[PDB]
């Protein structure tokens, strides 16, 4: 209710709750939060942006290729991580729609 | 797209979630099965003489 700007609002009402009736050993209640958010994005970015800054100069890039690893396999790589990106980025500030007879249709005429 | 020499960052983008889709939904389809009837009746006693 407080913050529902911080929730995807076409993933409605957001939460699995779980409740056990034990414990843990020394205090009277405690709880453990899971959190599934397209604000993890700022760690794929940033490791992809020292990958890059790192993998343009082939900074110690040698010692890898010295176990027979790959240039090219290391290369795309990058792309899997960039995609991941695009995975949060194509539901980051996404929006409820209308739904509707949104079908396409062309014009009354002999193609 | 023109850019900075040597190697350059490889990113794809096309976004995995349907479009706008022909799926409207909400039409009517049942209404509850309702005859109306006009009736009539006719009295009919004994009409001698």
Known sequence: NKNSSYFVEWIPNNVKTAVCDIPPRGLKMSATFIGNSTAIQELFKRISEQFTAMFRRKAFLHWYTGEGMDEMEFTEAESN??????????????????????????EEDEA | SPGTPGSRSRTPSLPTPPTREPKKVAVVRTPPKSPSSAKSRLQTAPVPM
């Open chain 1, 81 to 106: 991580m960039n995609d991941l990106v695009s995975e949060y980025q194509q539901y980051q500030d996404a929006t409820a729609d209308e739904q509707g007879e949104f079908e396409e249709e062309g």
